[PDB]
């Protein structure tokens, strides 16, 4: 199983300089060898066979070369060490011993499996031991995805190979927004093409002035043209060079308008000079090793009457036998019972049925529970959601019910087979914060930890294997059911329903209305989420008719289709249609943008093999910008036993087919394990120690040859295009603040790093949950992106943030930024901030700063208020030398203060102070009365309605995150906060009045209409 701690041994963080290692020779002898902790395995094997001669039966030992070592790793695995160039300190040994063995088996396969197991953080061999057929079938059947991907990748020899490794970082539309287009001097861009001339590697600039929608080849053509029969030369030599962004590994390999590329689009917008690098296809295409997919061991082996559900004339009943135990103080509780429910997503299909109350000490029920559902009426995604609740009725007539352990089961399995006979379910601890007696959003399946309450269950037997009917049988029954006048007004009511946010109230009258007009609904395809909620999922007649309608339903926008993938839409045909919409209309820019949510919704999936996991995997293996984040999002959650087996099997198939990128990933992984280990020492054995000594230990351990080999020359997990070269040890720091994170400075090793950034500074935080910060910066990017396309230059700087494990992750350090608290020092004025900005941007570019400050202020003012970000202060808010305002630490969102203090209020987290107002008003005495502030109020009123116009998207993004484990995001009611700040139950005029009132009450007047 996964490694307990990231130390060099069990209960030892770092090995002493020299360590005694027990060596188990093949003749049966044992040799105690003194080893240097950084000694490679080839050196150790040389010293051991020399020393072996001094022990009996040495004559039985073959050549040193005929052997390899095997030991017990921290993952409790017997690992064979084929890479004899590895150091003893990097072996992850449980205890200091080595067993000498003659290597048998498939060498190639054993090495790959070790490399995959190291990336995953779990040994592959644990999956082979899993008895469950679904698990083994998933590992078998997912390989066509892996095979198709590697086929597409080498179809176009070096080009398709390069398109996987360096995909185009392009926007979803070439259509330049009006406000961006006006920055182009006469509808055309000025680019700077740099080139390293081969004799002395001297940089040479060629400044072009070409049209924005000029394909990269045309940009190359004009570079050769700059240097009337020249056309023959350029036509032949324009296919022998490719363009690259100066300072990072971003390449212009596909025929997209130059303006469609994100670097170019950002440059136009920010009034910056695009610096590109001309190089030949040959110098890139050669550095590309051919990726090879191999059919694994488990594939090359087999590994080993029917009735319809509809021909069953009975109502559903499930028997609760007994439970092993529960953890309850016998004095504090009366009885215990098993609460059950049949659910379709988060909605019950019938009333919840409890068992009789029994003493905690005697959890035996042996009772049949009867449900108000006719077995033919059972939908395909029907589940049994149960739990063991306690019950006490000491104070008054008030009974206090408390869930002890929960578990969910799929009434049908992955083969469409209804569950029959006895079943043992190991239950899960109740999540923190959840108060409900049932957990329908929770994962399906037994708890892998067998040292937990176990519940026995009996499912009915009908004398045969009951299968859910075929799609031909369902299409038939729908034509039977349908066989058993528009009005301009009715078409208006329908139109109004489809425009409502996904969490708004649907009355029973509106439900009957929507179902009655289901055939007209195909004209307004966006109505499908609300219509699917007008269906009676506990009726096979309506379910059948819906299946037909969805089969030939027109495709919808991806953002509208993502809704059909949350916990509220479990039907395989719904999620099937939903996946087809993403397949045909979701761009690689949007998939990368909504990846967090797309990975999350994989948890709601009933089965391991599904169309979503296949779509996502196909894409992760087709694009390695997608594959890098797919790998990290899944990896960050491998400690969570609720998803570790699903994500583990997913990571296996991914690493098995991603090719050479596994080697780069393994480098990122081994770099991270070292930082986790270094920060674990400081947090434990060195917590009650001086910051001066802490740094002396830090610099000494960071100078170690084993540490440097691993923490230099690897890709950044925050952006794979960013190479992290040599660690600039002098600029590395342990931050003074309690939490004590690591500030690490790496040198950008790019040839022309000077044109981008020469240093890559990343913060390594070990102790805090970065997922909330991760989701906030994601939503903020999605907010700004809406504003830009609607013509708003509210320019926020959402820096990179990634969760790499349980309460461990990386944060981009924003260069040239200072906190307000820092600016207010080096006995303080309300002008200190304005003064600092006037002094850091003198004369001409004073207004360019004030514009940047006011625009970013409005962005943050609207973003923070909508989301309900944790209380803002001088330590949380920072300003760059530019004037660029940036907010840090978004650990809390929505009404996080609702449980602590009962006060129902939508707060204004970002109240612009006098200090802030002075900066916008350019130093004026009456700041609210200025024209500068009028343009600010206007920006906010626009930003707010832009977001309110896109509410549906944000509500879906949040809804897709309910099963993630985020404290502030555990129920649809937690999402109701966004419906209050965006005032969705009101009119756009009322909503904007609400915003203005909220702004006034917090700023004490000034916000004029």
């Amino acid at each position: 199983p996964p490694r307990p701690s990231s130390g060099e041994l069990w209960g030892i963080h770092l090995m002493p300089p020299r360590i005694l290692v027990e060596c188990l020779l093949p003749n049966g002898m044992i040799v105690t060898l003194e080893c240097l902790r950084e000694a490679t395995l080839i050196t150790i094997k040389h010293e051991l066979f020399k020393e072996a001669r001094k022990y009996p039966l040495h004559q039985l030992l073959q050549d040193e070369s005929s052997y390899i070592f095997v030991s017990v790793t921290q993952e409790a695995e017997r690992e064979e060490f084929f890479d004899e160039t590895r150091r003893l300190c990097d072996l992850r040994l449980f205890q200091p011993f080595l067993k000498v063995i003659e290597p048998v088996g498939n060498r190639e396969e054993k090495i790959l499996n070790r490399e995959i197991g190291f990336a995953i953080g779990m040994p592959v061999c644990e999956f082979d031991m899993v008895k469950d057929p679904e698990v083994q079938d998933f590992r078998r059947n997912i390989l066509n995805v892996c095979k198709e991907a590697v086929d597409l990748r080498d179809l176009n020899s070096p080009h398709s190979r390069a398109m996987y490794v360096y995909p185009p970082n392009v926007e979803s539309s070439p259509e330049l927004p009006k406000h961006i287009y006006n920055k182009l001097d006469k509808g055309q861009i000025i680019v700077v093409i740099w080139v390293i001339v081969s004799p002395n590697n001297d940089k040479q600039k060629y400044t072009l002035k070409i049209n924005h929608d000029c394909v990269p080849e045309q940009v190359i053509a004009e570079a050769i043209r700059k240097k009337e029969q020249l056309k023959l030369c350029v036509l032949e030599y324009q296919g022998k060079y490719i363009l690259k962004v100066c300072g990072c590994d971003e390449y212009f390999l596909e025929k997209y308008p130059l303006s469609q590329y994100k670097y170019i689009r950002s440059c136009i917008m920010l009034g910056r000079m695009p610096n590109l690098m001309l190089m030949a296809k040959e110098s890139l295409y050669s550095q590309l090793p051919m990726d090879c997919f191999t059919m694994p061991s488990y594939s090359r082996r087999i590994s080993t009457s029917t009735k319809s559900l509809w021909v069953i004339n009975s109502a559903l009943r499930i028997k609760i036998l007994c439970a092993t135990y529960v953890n309850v103080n016998i004095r504090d509780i009366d009885k215990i019972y098993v609460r059950t429910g049949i659910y379709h997503g988060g909605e019950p299909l019938c009333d919840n049925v409890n068992t009789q109350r029994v003493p905690c000490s005697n959890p035996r029920w042996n009772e049949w529970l009867n449900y108000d559902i006719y077995i033919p009426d059972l939908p395909r995604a029907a589940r049994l959601c149960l739990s063991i609740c306690s019950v006490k009725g000491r104070k008054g007539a008030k009974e206090e019910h408390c869930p002890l352990a929960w578990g969910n089961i799929n009434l049908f399995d992955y083969t469409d087979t209804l569950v029959s006979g006895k079943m043992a379910l190991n239950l899960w601890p109740v999540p923190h914060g959840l108060e409900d007696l049932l957990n329908p959003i929770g994962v399906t399946g037994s708890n892998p930890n067998k040292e937990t309450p176990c519940l026995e269950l009996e499912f009915d037997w009908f004398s045969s294997v009951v299968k859910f009917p075929d799609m031909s049988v369902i299409e038939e029954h729908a034509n039977w059911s349908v066989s058993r006048e528009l009005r301009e007004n009715d078409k208006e009511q329908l139109k109004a329903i489809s425009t409502r946010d996904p969490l708004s109230e649907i009355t029973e009258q509106e439900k009957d209305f929507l179902w009655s007009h289901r055939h007209y609904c195909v004209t307004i395809p966006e109505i499908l989420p609300k219509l699917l909620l007008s269906v009676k999922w506990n009726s096979r007649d309506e379910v059948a008719q819906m299946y037909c309608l969805v089969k030939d339903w027109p495709p919808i926008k991806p953002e509208q289709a993502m809704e059909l993938l949350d916990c509220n839409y479990p039907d395989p045909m719904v999620r099937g249609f939903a996946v087809r919409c993403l397949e045909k209309y979701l761009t690689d820019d949007k998939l990368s943008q909504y990846l967090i949510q797309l990975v999350q919704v994989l948890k709601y999936e009933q089965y391991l093999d599904n169309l979503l996991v296949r779509f996502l995997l196909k894409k992760a293996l087709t694009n390695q910008r997608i594959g890098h984040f797919f790998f990290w999002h899944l990896k960050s959650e491998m400690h969570n036993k609720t998803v570790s087996q699903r994500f583990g099997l997913l990571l296996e198939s991914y690493c098995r087919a991603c090719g050479m990128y596994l080697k780069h990933l393994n480098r990122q992984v081994e770099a991270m394990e070292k930082l986790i280990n270094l920060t674990d020492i400081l947090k434990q054995e060195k917590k009650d120690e001086t910051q001066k000594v802490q740094m002396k230990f830090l610099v000494e351990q960071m100078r170690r040859p084993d540490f440097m080999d691993a923490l230099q020359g690897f890709l950044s997990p925050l952006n794979p295009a960013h190479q992290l070269g040599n660690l600039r040890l002098e600029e590395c720091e342990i931050m003074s603040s309690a939490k004590r994170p690591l500030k690490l400075n790496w040198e950008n090793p790019d040839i022309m790093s000077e044109l981008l950034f020469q240093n890559n500074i990343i913060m390594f935080k070990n102790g805090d949950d970065l997922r909330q910060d991760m989701l906030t910066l994601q939503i903020i990017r999605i907010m700004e992106n809406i504003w830009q396309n609607q013509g708003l230059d509210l320019r926020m700087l959402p820096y990179g943030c990634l969760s790499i494990g349980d309460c461990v992750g990386l944060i981009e350090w924003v260069r040239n930024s200072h906190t307000i608290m820092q600016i207010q020092c080096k006995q303080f004025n309300s002008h200190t901030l304005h003064q600092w900005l006037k002094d850091k941007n003198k004369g001409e570019i004073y207004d360019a700063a004030i514009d940047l400050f006011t625009r970013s202020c409005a962005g943050y003012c609207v973003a923070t208020f909508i989301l309900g970000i944790g209380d803002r202060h001088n330590s949380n808010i920072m300003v760059k030398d530019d004037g660029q305002l940036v907010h840090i630490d978004f650990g809390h969102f929505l009404d996080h203060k609702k449980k602590k203090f009962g006060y129902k209020r939508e707060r204004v987290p970002f109240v612009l102070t006098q200090d802030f107002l002075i900066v916008i008003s350019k130093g004026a005495q009456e700041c609210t009365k200025t024209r500068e502030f009028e343009r600010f109020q206007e920006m906010c009123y626009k930003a707010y309605l832009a977001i309110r116009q896109h509410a549906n998207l944000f509500i879906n993004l949040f809804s897709m995150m309910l099963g993630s484990g985020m404290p502030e995001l555990q129920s649809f009611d937690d999402i109701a906060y966004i419906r209050k700040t965006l005032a969705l139950d009101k009119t756009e005029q009322e909503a904007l009045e609400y915003f203005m009132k909220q702004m006034n009450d917090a700023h004490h007047g000034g916000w004029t209409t």
């Binding site: 701690s5 188990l24 002898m29 009996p56 039966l57 909605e347 009611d973 139950d985």
Partner: protein, 257 residues
């Protein structure tokens, strides 16, 4: 006579109606003002909360045309005695009274003083539960580590014991070869290495035995923390519910808008 109707709750939120109907019997209901500014009735049937609109035109009320009833009261009262099966299949049986919702202190000073006591007790029990949760999370994680370390020991013991079996296979025919050649010092060498191996196995067996004993102790600690938390959890919910109630009765009694 609406506004003096136990089931009429005014500007109550949908989420509040949900809390009040959570785990209730089919027939349980309450009426409120629509999420606009218009009345919506909420009803429990099949474990779900069905929203039904109360339409109004020409002073007449109903769920659909024709609007037959004179007031929101007459409408409810008909359906309190007759089933919804005609409109559609349950009567409006169990009203959620605003009066039954106890909390009986007469004045603002008395309420305010009681709320201050509850809020204090609430933060106290909160910090207690939050520190218990931290103890629970830590213990559960350490138990996980011990169980992985025991697996690693089991395997180490298996490798080490395989080492004995190997020495046993090879040594037999060499001790016999040395007994003939009368090489008693070499027999001593083979035996000394074997003793060394069994002494290591003996230490590894004790390292596991000690850890298994820590695991037994930590598992029991976990069970205690679980029992202690399953006890704090229901009381904290009620203590939070009372606090929220005293806060509401204060917002209402005082100046509004």
């Amino acid at each position: 006579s609406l506004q003096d109707a136990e089931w009429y709750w005014g500007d109550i939120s949908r989420e509040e109606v949900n809390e009040k109907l959570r785990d209730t019997a089919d027939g349980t209901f309450l009426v409120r003002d629509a999420s606009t500014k218009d009345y919506t009735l909420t009803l429990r049937k099949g474990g779900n909360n069905k929203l039904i609109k109360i339409f109004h035109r020409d002073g007449k009320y109903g769920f659909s045309d024709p609007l037959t009833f004179s007031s929101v009261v007459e409408l409810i009262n008909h359906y309190r005695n007759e089933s919804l099966a005609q409109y559609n299949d349950v009567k409006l049986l169990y009203p959620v009274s605003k009066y039954q919702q106890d909390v009986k202190e007469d004045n603002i000073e008395a309420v305010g003083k009681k709320l201050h006591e509850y809020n204090t007790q609430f933060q106290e029990k909160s910090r207690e539960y939050d520190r218990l949760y931290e103890e629970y999370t830590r213990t559960s994680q350490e138990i996980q580590m011990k169980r992985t370390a025991i697996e690693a020991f089991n395997e180490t013991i298996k490798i080490f014991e395989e080492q004995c079996q190997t020495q046993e296979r090879y040594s037999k025919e060499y001790i016999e070869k040395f007994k003939r050649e009368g090489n008693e010092k070499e027999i001593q060498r083979i035996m000394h290495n074997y003793d060394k191996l069994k002494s290591r196995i003996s230490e590894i067996i004790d390292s596991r035995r000690r850890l298994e004993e820590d695991l037994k102790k930590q598992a029991a600690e976990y069970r205690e923390i679980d029992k202690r938390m399953n006890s704090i959890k229901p009381d904290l919910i009620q203590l939070r519910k009372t606090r929220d109630q005293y806060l509401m009765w204060l917002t209402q009694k005082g100046v509004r808008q």
